[PDB]
Amino acid sequence: NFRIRVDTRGHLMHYPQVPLVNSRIMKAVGFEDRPAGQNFVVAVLSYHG
Amino acid sequence: MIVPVRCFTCGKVLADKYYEFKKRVEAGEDPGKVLDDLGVERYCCRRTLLSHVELIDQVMVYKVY
Amino acid sequence: LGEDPKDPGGYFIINGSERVIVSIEDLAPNKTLVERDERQNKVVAKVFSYRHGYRALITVERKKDGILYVTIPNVPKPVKFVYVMRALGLLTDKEIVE
Amino acid sequence: VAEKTIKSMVSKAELPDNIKEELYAKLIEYNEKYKLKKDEIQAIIDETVREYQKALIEPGEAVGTVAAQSIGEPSTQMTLNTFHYAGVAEINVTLGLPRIIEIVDARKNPSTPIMTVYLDEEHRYDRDKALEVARRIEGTTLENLAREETIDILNMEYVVEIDPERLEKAGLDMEKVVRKLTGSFKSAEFEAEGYTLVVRPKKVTKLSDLRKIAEKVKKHRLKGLSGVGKTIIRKEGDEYVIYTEGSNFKQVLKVPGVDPTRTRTNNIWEIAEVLGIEAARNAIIDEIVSTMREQGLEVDVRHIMLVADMMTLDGVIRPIGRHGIVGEKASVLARAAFEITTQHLFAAAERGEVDPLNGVVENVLIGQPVPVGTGIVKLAMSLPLRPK
Amino acid sequence: RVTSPLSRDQPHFEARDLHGTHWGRICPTETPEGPNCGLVKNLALMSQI
Amino acid sequence: EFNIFDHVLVPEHRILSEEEKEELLKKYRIRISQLPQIKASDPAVVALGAKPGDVIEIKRKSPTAGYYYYYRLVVE
Amino acid sequence: FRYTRFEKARIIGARALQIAMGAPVLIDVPEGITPLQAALLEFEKGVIPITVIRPS
Amino acid sequence: VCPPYNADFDGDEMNLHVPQTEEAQAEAKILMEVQNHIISPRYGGPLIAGIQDHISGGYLLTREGAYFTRYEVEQMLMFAGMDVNELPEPDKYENGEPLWSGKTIFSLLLPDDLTIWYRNKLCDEPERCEALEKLIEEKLIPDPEEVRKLAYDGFVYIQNGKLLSGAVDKKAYGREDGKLLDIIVREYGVERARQFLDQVTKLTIWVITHKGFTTAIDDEDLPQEAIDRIHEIIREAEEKVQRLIEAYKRGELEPLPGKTLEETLESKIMAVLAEARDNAGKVAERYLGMNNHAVIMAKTGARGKILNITQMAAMLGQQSIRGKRLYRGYRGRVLTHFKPGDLGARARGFVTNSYKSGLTPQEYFFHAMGGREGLVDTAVRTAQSGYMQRRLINALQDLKVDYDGTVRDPTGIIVQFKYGEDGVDPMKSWQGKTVDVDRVIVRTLLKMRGG
Amino acid sequence: DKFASRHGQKGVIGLIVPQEDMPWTESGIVPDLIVNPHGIPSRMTVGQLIEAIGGKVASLTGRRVDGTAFIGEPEEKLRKELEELGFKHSGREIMYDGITGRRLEADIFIGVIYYQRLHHMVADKMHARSRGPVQVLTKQPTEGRAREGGLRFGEMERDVLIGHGAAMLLIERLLEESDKTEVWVCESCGHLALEDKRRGKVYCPVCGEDERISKVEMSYAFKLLLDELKAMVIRPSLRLKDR
Amino acid sequence: TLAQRLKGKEGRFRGNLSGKRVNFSARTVISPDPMISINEVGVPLAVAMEL
Ligand SMILES: [Mg+2]
Ligand SMILES: [Zn+2]
Ligand SMILES: [Zn+2]
Secondary structure (H helix, E strand, O other), rough: OOOOOOOOOOOOHHHHHHOOOEOOOOOOOOOOOOOOOEEEOOOEOOOOO | OOOOOOOOOOOOOOOOOOHHHHOOOOHHHHHHHHHOOOOOOOOEEEEHHHHHOOOOOHHHHHOOO | OOOOOOOOOOOOOOOOOOOOOOEEEOOOOOEEEEOOOOOOOOEEEEEEEEEOEEEOOOOOOOOOOOOOOOOOOOOOOEEEEEHHHHHHOOOHHHHHHO | OOHHHOOOHHHHHHHOHHHHHHHHHHHHOOOOOOOOOOOOHHHHHOOOOOOOOOOHHHHHHHHHHHHHHHHHHHOOOOOOOOOOOOOOOOOOOOOOOOHHHHHHHHOOOOOOOOOEEEOOOOOOOOOHHHHHHHHHHHOOOOOOOOOOOOOOOOOOOOOOOOOOOOOOOOOOHHHHHOOOOOOOOOOOOEEOOOOOOOOOOOOOOOOOOOHHEEEEEEEEOOEEEOOOOOEEEEOOOOOEEEEOOOHHHHHHHOOEEEOOOOOOOOOHHHHHHHHHHHHHHHHHHHHHHHHHHHOOOOOHHHHHHHHHHHHOOOOOOOOOOOOOOOOOOHHHHHHHOOOOOOHHOHHHHOOOOOOOOOHHHHHHHHHOOOOHHHHHOOOOOOOOOOOO | OOEEEOOOOOHHHHHHHOHHHHHOOOOOOOOOOOOOOOOOOEEOOOOOO | OOOOOOOOOOEEEEEEOOHHHHHHHOOOOOOHHOOOOEOOOOHHHHOOOOOOOEEEEEEEOOHHHHHEEEOOOOOO | OOOOOOHHHHHHHHHHHHHHHOOOOOOOOOOOOHHHHHHHHHHHHOOOEEEEEOOO | OOOOOOOOOOEEEEOOOEEEEEOOOOOHHHHHHHHHEEEOOOOOEEEOOOOOOHHHHHHOOOOOOOOOHHHHHHHOOOOOOOOOOOOOOOOOOOOEEEEEEEHHOOOOOOOOOOOEEEEOOOOOOOOOOOOOOOOHHHOOOOOOOOOOOOOOOOEEEEEOOOOOEEEOOOOOOOOOOOOHHHHHHHHHHOOOHHHHHHHHHHHHHHHHHHHOOOOOOHHHOOOHHHHHHHHHHHHHHHHHHHHHHHHHHHHHHHOOOOOHHHHHHHHHHHHHHHHHHHHHHHHHHHHHOOOOOOOHHHEEEEEEEOOHOOEEEEEOOOOOOOOOOOOOEEEEEEOOOOOOOOOOOOOOOOOOOOOOOOOHHHHHHHHHHHHHHHHHHHHHHHHHHHHHHHHHHHOOOOOOOEEOEEOOOOOOOEEEEOOOOEEEOOOOOOOOOOOOOOHHHHHHHHHHHOO | OOEEOOOOEEOOOOOOOOOOOOEOOOOOOOOOOOOOOOOOHOOHHHHHHHHHHHHHHHHHHOOOEEEEOOOOHHHHHHHHHHHHHOOOOOOOEEEEEOOOOOEOOOOOOOOEEEEEEEOOOOOOEEEEOOOOOOOOOOOOOOOOOOOOOOOEHHHHHHHHHHHHHOOHHHHHHHOOOOOOEEEEEOOOOEEEOEEOOOOOOOOOOOOOOOOEEEEEEEEEEHHHHHHHHHOOOOOOOOOOOOO | OOHHHHOOOOOOOOOEEEEEEEEEEEEOOOOOOOOOOOOOOOOOOHHHOOO
């Protein structure tokens, strides 16, 4: 119900995504039904500093 | 929040194969071949299609005129 | 109606802002706790007790010369345990002893 | 070229150089055994003076402020160490940041004192002789050689109890057993299995109140010298060093065998009354340094020496706050912004007093340039000035 | 949240340490840093009142 | 049997004759009352028999500049 | 006569302020320069006429 | 410039104010600029220097066998500001292809007269350092070919502007003591140092970037034989503790002098296990080679400690709280999963598994007790420090150094005849001493004799 | 803007480099976030490495790996499955550097880590003060972004500037950015004089005009402080001294 | 009254005299860039127009 609400400061991240590997508990709580974040694809190396 | 029409790393259209994916996987057809059976080679395109939530149907019900 | 089913509730909507009472961890009323040893005096016991709003402390200390005192909130000035015991309701020495 | 010929070239050049550099340079410049000839030797001395001449402090510095900040910065990075070391002798000496706070303040009392005792040329390499000294200073009453106390039944009235073996394996001197009646209050007599019993067959004073007898006889034992405590020995570089707990300076020097010229003591005050004031200054410096080195960090010695010298400026050592320098004389305004209570001490100055300025906080409150830094320079310039 | 009623500044070393009884009643890790640290704690997931 | 001397913490205090007072006081261009001031107690002054209104010359060793001098008075 | 660090800063600071309010400049031509940077080039050539009264 | 501010980069904020009046502005630029503060007044050493990538990249650039092809050399001298003419010359190795030894490219930065030699952290063979240590004393100028080309990787030897032997690590740059950046600011003013510092940074970065410096997950792996080696150590160390407990029960204790019997038992136990953890650490420093991308960071000094690399493939060790072992719990035990009255190794908080293999439920809870300790302390230690500093500032801020070299308080009471036991400023003195005769002799005698 | 994983690798976006100059793997993958390798074997977050491999296996297979504490997917299965899917077991690959273009002479790790954007966004931190409205009765600048304020120059900031020796810089910063009031002091009395408009002249109380009165510049704050002493029976004689 | 006016632990030394917020300033987050000289600082162009 974010679009019908009055609150001092709210946030809305456009495209959230379900986290690849998670915990079994997170599904039984309801975090998977309204998540908060995205899956990047990271490489580890030191670039130009 | 309807499926990202492009992937986030590899530029390739992807919305046109979301729906056809979902209904087929919700009948028992194993995901590891459905994705393969379509044009999804690298895994970078694959992550955005596997993990997504499409909340748009719940939010649409409420209105703001 | 206009609510989301995932909302668990448990808060008030006083004056617009959503206020919630965070539970406060008490120190077990109507109990007895024997305090430690040999810092300034000997051992002391402390008991919190509340009855209708007010909560007061009642220690029955015994400092290292055997006086054995009691603290009262209103005006510190400790009194001997046997002094206070007779002012309460036990007269004979056999009463206290037994 | 030889020894005597370079003891003169240095000599007439030593005027811009200092005393210490004279001894060091000659000794070292000699000790290079492939020894150069003459012309270059002059050049080295010529070069050396340039470095020294370039190292002096620029007059106008603010040595007070940088000394405070450099000592107050590592306190933030004062992390833990291996507090449970694999050592034995020194135990619970209160390291860390709270140690620094104790030395920066006066405090007659301080928590866990230790005094260090070295020994002369007979006790320096032998275990049996170091122990006799140690045993002579420990000092054991009667309330430590026991486990508890209770009373008896009818006429016995009291009893002394376990244990008795603290003399027949440690070696604490049966001759002094007879001594005990040295002006003692009561003192009965029953040395059976080494544990002296004490029977009192009397009256009205004590009957069974075994608590108040603490201040009596029980505390009044004296099985040793120097009413101080535990004594731990340690071989510190083939020398036995005696580490004692507590402190008792007046009577420790008057003990056979303790070398009086090398004992150092962690108690700041006791060193000032026995050794002297200047010796207290050295004790301040040494102690702060010791703390920093055992943490890893290092701080340059000139900062510590400034604070230590400045603190002993009256003869009597006084704390750095509220009872010392900020409380002592400054200008009247330099105590107005410190510990607001001032309405008894502030009105004191109202009876015959002046003030010029030249502080730091007075000039910043009034709008004048402070006398440190650039403020201490004055310019002058002749005014024809044809431009050309 | 479960809160304790003490002083936010003076150090209570014996009140902040994770006591053994917290197992299964109070979360061992969830504790916000700052001047509080240890005073405010969180209920474990598997605990009834 | 000991003394204030012969110890690794107390340096050798010595006293100046009357002449050197004026000579010293001209160099640093200062008044008499502006010097540090020991007390009439503490062994290092009473052993040498010093009177109030004196400038004791204390020479102490500093592990950086070698030999460094100082000057102090005595009051009650 | 070698300046100390504190005296150097002051001389520049004093000299720079004079250059703003008039006070003709020596050869210091290039292109548009602040009054501060003007004092730096003049000092680098050792032509600053301000002498330090030394207290001695 | 991010040791002096003590800043990191995870959101920390800084403010900037701009002075206005011409006297104030001038004063700020001459007296407070960054280059005048490379050495810190607290200790005699450089404060502004190379950090994490700057040190680690410097090692890869100067190891035995770092041959950079012609294209790369050319490309990187243009990345580091320096501006040379047609002298890359002359191609040390032309066997495979015409190419350049790593030492010569680094040598293009030091001025043409720096002679310095010092042992550094990466040495591991105190004999091979010493075989070369005599050939510098009794000759002072040899031919470079004989035994300097019989070089080691841990004995920095620079002679008249040429790095013959040695490798660069945290003994050249860095926030703690580095005796290369140190010497270059004393000998050759202040303005030179910033260019040498600046050009080293952009150089060292360009090699590290284009060369590849990742860490994977196999960097912490040990084979099956080494794993079994650690396991037998943990079994014996446990059984040693059990034997002492049985001795305590039967009253054959043999107790320590000072502490009481109950504390003697604990004192003996902690020493037994601390040896066993460190013994496992010696095994970890032995088997996994020095040529993977993780140990390299540990031995040079760029976010390293050999103690944590070993703590990722071996025992964690005991777990303590302010000294004593874990006692705070139920009436007779720590957790309710052990039997009442067990002072054994495993029961009283000793984790046996590492972070790779994974912690069990009992052990994981024990580790949390030791981690809250570090959290609480750090915020408390700051409180006492800040107040304490306010005391000493409001007591010493008045002192100045007069022109005759005398420190006087504002009432003319002379606090110190000849400042700081005269007369060298701590910002310019050599590790507590002054002028340093041992350095000046070697320096001037070498420049004249060498010609 | 601030980004941080769910393990504790807090960080700020450093540069938003064009897609072309980015090193890429001998396949079609182009990395999105390049993390400094000095942060993993320093903090000891082995869980970060395991999650990277775990996301790669999970994306290829198609099922979501279960990672709950203590009963999660055993470490050895993800490494043994990753190989049979067609990838070096260790997570590393051959990468080509996008700037020039040649393989790095090492293998470069790559994974699928779940990040999350935190709300400490730069739009709510940056603000500047030129010269704002201040208090009237106490005369100090205001606080916050809704009333245009930054931080203050109190106790510690004076002592640092004194340490350098910047006398001139000091004065400008702490006083001149307020009010400076000029008052006429009598030389032999010490008491503040008194004007009179319409005639245009000064006049101190005790001595009538003959005695040379002199101008003195001081901070308005200090003038009020003298008055408080003057309201009592204390006389603050200001004895001036010549240039 | 007067003795609570000049002092009373919160009067007019530490409150308004010896410490103030100042003018001509700015405050924001920092991010790295090793491609500028050791003494230079990058200032965002929005802040450059307000000072
Ligand atoms: Mg930070
Ligand atoms: Zn993709
Ligand atoms: Zn007048």
